[PDB]
Design a protein around this ligand. Structure first.
Ligand SMILES: Nc1nc2c(ncn2[C@@H]2O[C@H](COP(=O)(O)OP(=O)(O)OP(=O)(O)O)[C@@H](O)[C@H]2O)c(=O)[nH]1
Ligand SMILES: [Mg+2]
Ligand SMILES: [Mg+2]
Ligand SMILES: [Zn+2]
Ligand SMILES: [Zn+2]
Ligand SMILES: [Zn+2]
Lengths: 138, 159, 196, 65, 559, 168, 133, 43, 49, 263, 83, 114
RNA sequence: AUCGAGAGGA
């Protein structure tokens, strides 16, 4: 219905895009604690939602924007070493080595992108109580 | 450029001087030109300082250049080391390369020259030029599995 | 590790007693040093942990999504209203003594993952045993109870101390100790030693 | 993977409540913030034991032998 | 290269390593199950049959036990097997391969071994739990974490080989660096971040704790020290009881920029005879520093004396910290409201002064500077303009941090992180760069398809006006990403180039040893240096001594 | 002025004035013979090389040289009797100790400095990357100006990246 | 082993400089013009506002380990409340004569000027500090 | 499993870079650390 | 939950990893430094679909 | 009374909130640390699987059983497996149970702790009763069976204490506090603008006086008066929890006085 | 070849390498029931006892320090300054 | 595989006394007592009740290594008056207050409903 | 066991 186009990188060259599909069109008092955005009125097509640049393991990251990117990367390589419930069918698959976490739990903060990644339903960890403290020195 | 200078009164006071920065190298003739101090002229190229001002200026250029890589932003290595490195590169005559080319030739024991970067051809010529191996290096006695004339084996022990 | 590249291994396990605790009696599952924070820049870890608290008390599942209008100062207003102070903290009492910790601790739920690699899969010990045929050197891998390789770079360090006899041992009585018969003239390995 | 007996942090029994939790969420229709409370779960460590739990045995049970 | 100069070796162990502040510097936390397996041949002298017969009886399971006994005839005796494992007469001259007991010489390294330091002789304390355990202050010269870093351990077979480790390679002897003439091991983390808290003039402790902290240092003379206060309450000072660790005959003098023998702000350092006079103790003093305490105590009788100290400092500091506690919150990157305004206008002016220098290059003239030509150019100009806009905001967010800001503590102590660390966390992350130049144009005449072609402004070439506490924007996010990648790139590749630079340097000097006439030669007898380092002096023993004959006035010379 | 020099003097000074502490205001007991004829004699038995022929004893002085200018400047009469106020016993000590200190700062015949002349050299570089990173921007100079410029200096580089000439 | 000095002093400035317990006190001397004082007083144990008048005895008596009390009831105050223990270090100079002393009560310092000098002040190791009213 | 099925390996001017024309096709932070870093990306 | 896409071979699962290549049939301009004989080169990888 | 002055304000079948006046801090702490760990209970500690066709593997279910709350009131007159004189287990040291269920129904057959059957002679004391707090009467979901899956088992339960595993705690959650108004200044508050607007005023303010602006700081005043709440799992009713605590605390306190006399 | 009793210009101190190697070469000697010379206070470690035999210079061995040219210099442990 | 058995926290092994006494090598009239198989539930309680006695010069303890839960206690007391007795006398003070605790609790437990 | 491929850990 002429609502979405597919665009590849070669065709990307001659286009203008908006983030934030709203941010970023309409008309021209504001929170000081909120972040700082930049802004052309000659756009071709809006991006769906920024957070879609991410892959799989990256969209498992809560507040990846609030994190130093080299860590986001470090987390990605570790997400695929995480321990959980890789399939439901394990109990009749005869693969060499498979670990299941005794008691999985969905995370507490969830990137919208987890719903399509189906994380909430097959977690790989536990919301365990964390104490950022100096103690014994161990 | 700032510079500390003997102020006849006694103290070291800061002396501002105009200095010229160049993006080209031809020492052979720059220093011969009227109006400059042909005692302080410095090109970052130590390869040319070698041919123009003799091996002993190079000894001091090479160093000063390794200094400007290492000890810039805070790093510190005690003169001994860089100077030790510098000296090795300097006594064989010209500027000895830290590669297979240079130090992996200078009439050393072949077995030791073997454990570096070219391997077979080195033995190949050893058998050809019928080399005799000194058996006095570190490598030698390692490959020969012995107590190499190193730290605790500088000496034998008798009664 | 948690969800931000925060690797650290358990250094010790203290039971619920020696562990610090809160005026409600919440005992934390997990104590990380505030030293792997700034280091290390990982400010989200802090946010996740703050959001999760809210999420757990209010019941609502928190929104951790990337480029969205969510403020710490906006979590702070919501945690404030829930009986705890706006930036995470909680007065804690040392467990050995019951004496109030003179500093306030940051405390809350943060989704932690269990990665593989566990000491009891890595621990390797060898002395003598099985060796290859091509080299009479000790075989590779803990899979066949093999030795470690004392690589070239390892040799280098020893020379720096000048462990003489050490190198002889670490390249003889712990690898190859073959004994050949050499000619006093043609000095090669052809002599027949009919013995004993 | 089946509600755990008791919570890791406190120690309070939490098993008994999974049955009742579904009923307070779906039968008489409530939000969780109320639901965990009527269930006597005040401390958040024992609160997360149920809110965060995903019950996989269900899909284990769908299997035949 | 791999089978002669790099031999696979027996008698070795490999494990995950963990931190243990209750061990001593020269120690190694060997797990029991390895201790069961790693042997050491010992001949049977009438000195040591007592301990040894016993040892055979214990067998290859009870820890103080053994595997294998070797006879006069060259016969081998397995101990887990064999039908006489439950006795055996021990003759004089028999090898009795045995488990490793406590206090034994062993080498304990970590690859990559880029030192002589990353290979140190240790003292064995057999412990349960399968982790290798080492003293928190020997952490620096191996370069090891406990995030799963894996270390290795070796075991001598001759007594002379033992002697060779424990004389030359032992951690104590390797304290002060024969490389940078300053001690490599210092007080790090929990210990160093609390040695400051302890010491603050403000901080006092009383009887109940004071009496305990004393009982924590093992070389305590049983002499309570007299409290600095005997007013309505008896108190000691944080300084007071630390001095208990500082051994008798030790002397240190500092002065910083603001140091007045008063020190209102308690700057610098003064120590007389194992007692702290005034000054906050941190990384300048108690650290892996040049003119620090560790240096002073080592060179003054001696090695082990200094090494025994490291431990006693820790044991106390830890104890105090344990009861005082410490953390870090999201409020520890929060700054004053009317100051994040002050950072936004600090950028806004630096931004709206880029727009000045920008609307010149477009003008253009320009005063196109003479060299500095250019194009070099305007694309260097704005690099500094933004690297300025950051280091002011980084400072404007350091005053904001009151004395209690859990981050500033670790910075003032230097436990981990510094200025830039705070800057990014609280103000703005700054101009991300690629190969030292701001984000390169990938797309034709633009950076991304969110910008219009030809946008040389900061907001387009990779400047992030936001902080981590505000969370980067998508446009920005990618750019910071772009860079981050670049650091990891060389963690796999530019690392080669370097480690190759070394492998050469190593092979090129190698046998350059100071001979018995103080002349520095090679394998042939070529002279290289005539006196090592042109003064015949070992670097370890050398200190940064000021030559006060050079500075000053002619009049300041005469009188 | 601030340079690496063997054996701290400034220390054995403070180690003097609290071991016999004098200290006030209460005067010395060494003649200007004990001070000046002593230093020159210590200067004699300091040693780095030992021998009996002329060439050795000459390179000998030509190694001590610098260290002495330091010794000579802090063991100078005015100061030895004004700022530090030593005594016959505590000076004799300072002397016997600086000597005893010195000949412990010899390089041991055996030391392998070639390898040490490594690493060292080839050390920080590796971990001054291979840190590597940390973490973001900018970041170096060091590792990019740089560590490639060092690959030049050791290959004997003719194809020189940045040739630069500085005239005074 | 007897009482040492004693004088009457007046508070000129109380600066709560980046601390909460332990403040800096700047006092001038009563009667005697040729004297100034800077001292470190734990304000969380003994309050001092501006223009307060005080009393300041020194002393050096009232191996041996340090005992608690056992009251008995040795000695030494009721009328001296704020008591501290410390060490002497370096001795100044300015006129000739005069002349000042340096005191470290376990990190909390004291500078005192003026010529009496004394010499009923010792170079030495002891040093108490007593303050009343 | 998800992140493995969608993997992208490259054989062999500047290659392991995260380059501007990766926006929204490759993941700017997903990639193995060391060994073959920056070559093998994820969609 | 298994979304498939792997080839089952010898009783193990196998995945095809996208192989990357430079796109053919595009005109690309290369330099190319020139000590060295030449200074500029036009290149096109030409193959049929 | 002579010393410690305990006062209750709220008490229930599962919660015991109370003041604790005029005692040294060290005790208050020594008290909870016993209550957490050192007090004995009973729980499963030897399972023997005969048939299990559940989707839950064998040592999983096994693990779970240990945790399940077991009535322990008369536990004082029961002997430890270690301290007894029989082989493995008996009826003067161990209480055995038995679990049986088999999928018969086509619609999800549950198993509960009700389904636990005592098997060994009880001697006639109150001990080893699966504790139900459940509204409906089915205490804590153990496991799920489908259509034709069996679970046959044989639990043995021994006496134990929290230091040997967390199952042996009647603990639950111990609330602890003193000096809600920072009178003793044992802690120093992290603040941004102002202490009192940014921290909360505790549950423990009523019946403790505010300090009043101009009043100078009291140096020598010590920690008196603690505000505690002690939850029970249900194995030992709330009153006996705190009691035995004191007791065992005193029990092994006595053990030193006895051992010192043996010197 | 060889150097005579006089003309000694080598370092008259024990190099740590001579230390460890002498302590060591005595170690194996002690450990293989060979006669021990000094009064054994109560110790039994071939490595501690030898540290005592070096305190009172009673080790009959002699170093032989080789010079680059080939000729050697003697020196006994009884003759050496241990430091 | 290396983990110590859980019961090695109260089971006293063979040839192991619950108390060891050794006098302090340095100060006179003082003792270091080795409390085996115990934590600082006993460690803290004994110590902060050796303080209320004015006849004790010194009183303190340390958890040597959280690996082996066994502490040491150092006691110095006024000349003549033996330390072993100090510990003895102090112990009873605890018991008595504890003995009261049982009663006073029970008093006020009885009166309450639910 | 050998040669060959890949994935991960610092
Ligand atoms: N030889 C080699 N060593 C590496 C390589 N990658 C990492 N390392 C080593 O492992 C360390 C990696 O960093 P970490 O130990 O984890 O310490 P960190 O800098 O705090 O980084 P993180 O702890 O992971 O956040 C470096 O210090 C290196 O010494 C590699 O590819 N080759
Ligand atoms: Mg690490
Ligand atoms: Mg790390
Ligand atoms: Zn022949
Ligand atoms: Zn809980
Ligand atoms: Zn029984």
């Amino acid at each position: 219905e002429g609502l979405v186009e597919y665009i590849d990188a070669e065709e990307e060259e001659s286009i203008l895009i908006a983030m934030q599909p709203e941010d970023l069109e309409p008309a021209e008092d504001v929170d000081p604690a909120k972040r700082i955005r930049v802004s052309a009125t000659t756009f071709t097509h809006c991006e769906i939602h920024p957070s879609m640049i991410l892959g799989v393991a990256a969209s498992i990251i809560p507040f990846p924007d609030h994190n130093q990117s080299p860590r986001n990367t470090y987390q990605s390589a570790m997400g695929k070493q995480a321990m959980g419930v890789f399939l439901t069918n394990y109990n009749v698959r005869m693969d060499t080595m498979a670990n299941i976490l005794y008691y999985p739990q969905k995370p507490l903060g969830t990137t919208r992108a987890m719903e399509y990644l189906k994380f909430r339903e097959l977690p790989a960890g536990q919301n365990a109580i964390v104490a950022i403290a100096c103690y014994s020195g161990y | 450029y700032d510079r500390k200078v003997p102020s006849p009164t006694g103290e070291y006071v800061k002396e501002p001087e105009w200095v010229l920065e160049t993006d080209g190298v031809n020492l052979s003739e720059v220093m011969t030109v009227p109006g400059i101090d042909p005692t302080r002229i410095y090109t970052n190229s130590f390869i040319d300082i070698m041919e123009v001002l003799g091996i002993e200026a190079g000894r001091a250029a090479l160093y000063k250049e390794v200094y400007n890589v290492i000890a810039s932003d805070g790093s510190y290595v005690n003169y001994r080391h860089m100077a030790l490195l510098v000296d090795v590169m300097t006594t064989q005559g010209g500027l000895t390369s830290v590669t297979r080319h240079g130090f992996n030739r200078s009439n050393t024991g072949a077995l030791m020259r073997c454990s570096f970067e070219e391997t077979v051809e080195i033995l190949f010529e050893a058998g050809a030029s019928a080399e005799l191996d000194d058996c006095r290096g570190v490598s030698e006695n390692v490959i020969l599995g012995q107590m190499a004339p190193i730290g605790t084996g500088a000496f034998d022990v008798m009664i | 590790a948690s969800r931000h590249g925060q690797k650290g291994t358990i250094g010790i396990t203290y039971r619920r007693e020696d562990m610090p605790f809160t005026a409600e009696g919440i005992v934390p599952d997990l104590i990380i040093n505030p030293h792997a924070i700034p280091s290390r820049m990982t400010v989200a870890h802090l946010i996740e942990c703050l959001l999760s608290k809210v999420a757990a008390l209010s019941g609502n599942e928190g929104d951790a999504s990337p480029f969205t209008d969510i403020t710490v100062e906006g979590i702070s207003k919501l945690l404030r209203e829930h009986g705890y102070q706006s930036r995470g903290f909680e007065v804690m009492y040392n467990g050995h003594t019951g004496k109030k910790l003179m500093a306030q601790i940051f405390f809350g739920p943060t989704y932690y993952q269990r990665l593989r690699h566990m000491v009891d899969d890595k621990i390797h010990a060898r002395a003598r045993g099985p060796m290859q045929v091509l080299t009479r050197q000790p075989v590779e891998g803990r899979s066949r109870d093999g030795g470690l390789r004392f690589g070239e770079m390892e040799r280098d360090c020893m020379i720096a101390h000048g462990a003489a006899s050490f190198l002889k041992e670490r390249l003889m009585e712990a690898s190859d100790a073959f004994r050949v018969h050499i000619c006093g003239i043609c000095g090669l390995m052809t002599v027949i030693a009919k013995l004993n | 993977m089946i509600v755990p007996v008791r919570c890791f942090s406190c120690g309070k029994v939490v098993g008994d409540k999974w049955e009742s939790y579904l009923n307070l969420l779906q039968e008489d229709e409530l939000d969780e913030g109320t639901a965990l409370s009527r269930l006597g779960l005040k401390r958040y460590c024992c609160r997360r034991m149920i809110l965060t739990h995903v019950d996989l045995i269900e899909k284990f049970l769908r299997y035949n032998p | 290269r791999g089978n002669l100069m790099g031999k696979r070796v027996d008698f070795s162990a490999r494990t995950v390593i963990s931190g243990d502040p209750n061990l001593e510097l020269d120690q190694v936390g060997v797990p029991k199950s390895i201790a069961k397996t790693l042997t050491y041949p010992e001949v049977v002298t009438p000195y040591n049959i007592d301990r040894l017969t016993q040892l055979v009886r214990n067998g290859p399971n009870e820890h103080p036990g053994a595997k294998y006994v070797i006879r006069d005839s060259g016969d081998r005796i397995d101990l887990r097997y064999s039908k006489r494992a439950g006795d055996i007469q021990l003759q004089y001259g028999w090898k009795v391969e045995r488990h490793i007991m406590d206090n034994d010489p062993v080498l304990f390294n970590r690859q990559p071994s880029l030192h002589k330091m990353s290979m140190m002789a240790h003292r064995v304390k057999v412990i349960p739990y399968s982790t290798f355990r080492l003293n928190l202050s020997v952490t620096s010269p191996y370069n090891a974490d406990f995030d799963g870093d894996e270390m290795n351990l070796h075991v001598p077979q001759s007594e002379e080989t033992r002697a060779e480790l424990s004389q030359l390679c032992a951690v104590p002897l390797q304290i002060v660096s024969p490389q940078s003439n300053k001690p490599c091991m210092g007080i790090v983390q929990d210990t160093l971040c609390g040695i400051r808290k302890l010491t603050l003039r403000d901080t006092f402790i009383e009887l109940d704790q004071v009496l305990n902290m004393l009982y924590w240092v093992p070389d305590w003379d049983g002499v309570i020290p007299t409290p600095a206060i005997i007013k309505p309450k008896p108190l000691w000072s944080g300084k007071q009881i630390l001095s208990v660790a500082i051994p008798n005959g030790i002397h240190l003098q500092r002065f910083d920029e603001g140091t007045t023998l008063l020190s209102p702000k308690d700057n610098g350092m003064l120590i007389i005879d194992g007692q702290i006079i005034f000054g906050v103790v941190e990384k300048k003093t108690v650290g892996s520093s040049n003119g620090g305490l560790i240096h002073v105590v080592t060179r003054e009788k001696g090695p082990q004396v200094c090494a025994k100290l490291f431990g006693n400092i820790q044991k106390v500091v830890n104890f105090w910290l344990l009861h005082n506690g410490f953390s870090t919150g999201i409020g520890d990157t929060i700054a004053d409201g009317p100051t994040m305004r002050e950072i936004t206008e600090t950028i806004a002016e630096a931004k709206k002064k880029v727009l000045d220098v920008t609307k010149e290059a477009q003008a253009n003239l320009l005063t196109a500077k003479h060299g500095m030509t250019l194009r070099e150019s305007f694309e260097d100009n704005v690099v500094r303009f933004l690297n300025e806009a950051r280091d002011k905001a980084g400072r404007l967010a350091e005053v904001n941090l009151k004395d209690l800001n859990n981050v500033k503590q670790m910075v003032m102590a230097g436990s981990k992180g510094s200025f830039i660390n705070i800057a990014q966390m609280s103000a703005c992350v700054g101009q991300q760069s690629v190969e030292g130049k701001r984000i390169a144009f990938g797309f034709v005449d633009r950076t991304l398809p969110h910008f219009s072609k030809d946008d040389y402004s900061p907001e387009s070439k990779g400047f992030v006006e936001n902080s981590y506490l505000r969370g980067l924007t998508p446009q920005e996010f990618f750019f910071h990403a772009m860079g981050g990648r670049e650091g990891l790139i060389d963690t796999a590749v530019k690392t080669a180039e370097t480690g190759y630079i070394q492998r050469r340097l190593v092979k090129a000097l190698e046998d350059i040893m100071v001979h018995y006439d103080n002349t520095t030669r090679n394998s042939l007898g070529n002279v290289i240096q005539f006196i090592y380092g042109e003064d015949g002096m070992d670097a370890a023993h050398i200190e940064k001594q000021s030559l006060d004959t050079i500075g000053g006035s002619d009049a300041a010379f005469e009188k | 002025a601030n340079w690496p020099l063997p054996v701290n003097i400034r220390r054995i000074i403070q180690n003097a004035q609290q071991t016999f502490h004098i200290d006030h205001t209460k005067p010395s007991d060494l003649t200007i013979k004990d001070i000046v004829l002593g230093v020159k004699d210590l200067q004699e038995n300091l040693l780095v090389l030992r021998g009996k022929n002329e060439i050795i004893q000459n390179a000998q002085r030509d190694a001590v040289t610098l260290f002495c200018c330091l010794l000579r400047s802090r063991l100078a009469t005015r100061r030895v009797l004004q700022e530090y106020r030593l005594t016959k016993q505590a000076f004799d000590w300072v002397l016997s100790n600086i000597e005893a200190q010195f000949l412990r700062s010899v390089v041991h015949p055996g030391e392998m400095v070639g390898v040490l002349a490594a690493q060292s050299i080839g050390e920080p570089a590796t971990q001054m990357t291979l840190n590597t990173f940390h973490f973001a921007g900018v970041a170096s100079k060091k590792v990019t100006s740089g560590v490639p410029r060092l690959k030049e200096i050791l290959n004997v580089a003719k194809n020189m990246k940045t040739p630069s000439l500085t005239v005074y | 082993s007897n009482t040492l000095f004693d004088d009457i002093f007046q508070v000129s400035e109380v600066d709560p400089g980046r601390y909460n317990k332990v403040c800096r006190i700047e006092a001038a001397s009563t009667t005697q013009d040729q004297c100034k004082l800077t001292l470190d007083i734990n304000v969380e144990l003994f309050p001092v506002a501006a223009q307060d008048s005080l009393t300041v005895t020194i002393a050096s008596s009232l191996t041996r380990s340090w005992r608690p009390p056992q009251a008995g009831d040795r000695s030494l105050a009721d009328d001296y409340d704020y008591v501290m223990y410390g060490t002497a270090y370096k001795f100044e100079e300015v006129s000739k004569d005069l002349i000042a002393v340096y005191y470290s009560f376990g990190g909390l310092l004291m500078r005192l000027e003026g010529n009496y000098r004394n010499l009923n002040n010792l170079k030495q190791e002891n040093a108490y500090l007593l303050i009343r009213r | 499993t998800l992140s493995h099925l969608r993997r992208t390996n490259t054989p062999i001017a500047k290659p392991r870079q995260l380059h501007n024309t990766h926006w929204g096709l490759v993941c700017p932070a997903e990639t193995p650390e060391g060994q073959a870093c920056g070559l093998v990306k994820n969609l | 939950f298994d979304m498939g896409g792997y080839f089952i071979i010898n009783g193990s699962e196998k995945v095809l990893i996208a192989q990357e290549r430079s796109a053919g049939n595009i005109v690309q301009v290369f330099k190319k430094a020139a000590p060295s004989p030449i200074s500029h080169v036009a290149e096109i990888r030409s193959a049929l679909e | 009374e002579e010393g410690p002055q305990v006062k209750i304000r709220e008490a229930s079948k599962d919660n015991v909130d109370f003041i604790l006046s005029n005692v040294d801090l060290a005790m208050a702490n020594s008290l909870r640390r016993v209550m957490i760990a050192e007090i004995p209970t009973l729980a499963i500690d030897s399972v023997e699987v005969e048939t299990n066709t559940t989707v839950l593997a064998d040592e999983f279910i096994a693990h779970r059983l240990g945790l399940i709350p077991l009535q322990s009131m008369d536990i004082e007159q029961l002997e430890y497996s270690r301290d007894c004189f029989c082989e493995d287990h008996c009826d003067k040291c161990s209480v055995v149970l038995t679990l049986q269920a088999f999928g018969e129904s086509e619609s999800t057959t549950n198993v509960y702790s009700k389904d636990l059957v005592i098997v060994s002679n009880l001697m006639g004391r109150n001990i080893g009763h699966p504790i139900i707090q459940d509204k409906e009467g089915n205490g804590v979901l153990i496991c799920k069976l489908r259509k034709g899956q069996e679970l046959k088992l044989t639990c043995v339960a021994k006496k134990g204490i929290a230091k040997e595993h967390a199952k042996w705690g009647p603990a639950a959650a111990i609330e602890f506090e003193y000096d809600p108004w920072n009178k003793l200044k044992h802690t120093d508050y992290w603040y941004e603008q102002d202490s009192a607007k940014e921290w909360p005023q505790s549950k423990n303010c009523e019946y403790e006086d505010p300090p009043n602006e101009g009043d100078p700081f009291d140096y020598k005043a010590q920690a008196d008066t603690f505000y505690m709440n002690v939850e029970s799992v249900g194995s030992i009713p709330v009153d006996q929890v705190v009691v035995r605590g004191i007791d065992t605390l005193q029990k092994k306190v006595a053990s030193i006085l006895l051992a010192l006399t043996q010197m | 070849k060889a150097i005579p009793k006089d003309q000694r210009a080598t370092t008259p101190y024990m190099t740590k390498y001579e230390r460890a190697r002498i302590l060591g070469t005595r170690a194996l000697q002690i450990s293989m029931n060979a006669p021990v010379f000094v009064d054994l206070e109560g110790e039994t470690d071939p490595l501690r006892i030898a540290m005592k035999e070096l305190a009172e210079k009673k080790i009959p061995l002699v170093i032989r320090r080789y010079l680059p040219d080939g000729s050697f210099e003697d020196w006994s442990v009884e003759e050496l300054i241990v430091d | 595989m290396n983990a110590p058995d859980r019961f090695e926290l109260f089971l006293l092994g063979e040839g192991e006394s619950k108390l060891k006494i050794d006098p302090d090598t340095k100060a006179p009239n003082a003792v270091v007592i080795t409390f085996e198989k115990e934590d600082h539930t006993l460690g803290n309680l004994i110590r902060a009740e050796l303080l209320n006695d004015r006849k004790v010069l010194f009183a303190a303890y340390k958890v040597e290594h959280p690996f082996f839960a066994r502490f040491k206690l150092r006691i110095q007391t006024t000349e003549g008056y033996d330390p072993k007795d100090a510990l003895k006398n102090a112990c009873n003070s605890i018991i008595n207050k504890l003995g009261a605790l049982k009663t006073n609790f029970e008093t006020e437990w009885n009166l309450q409903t639910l």
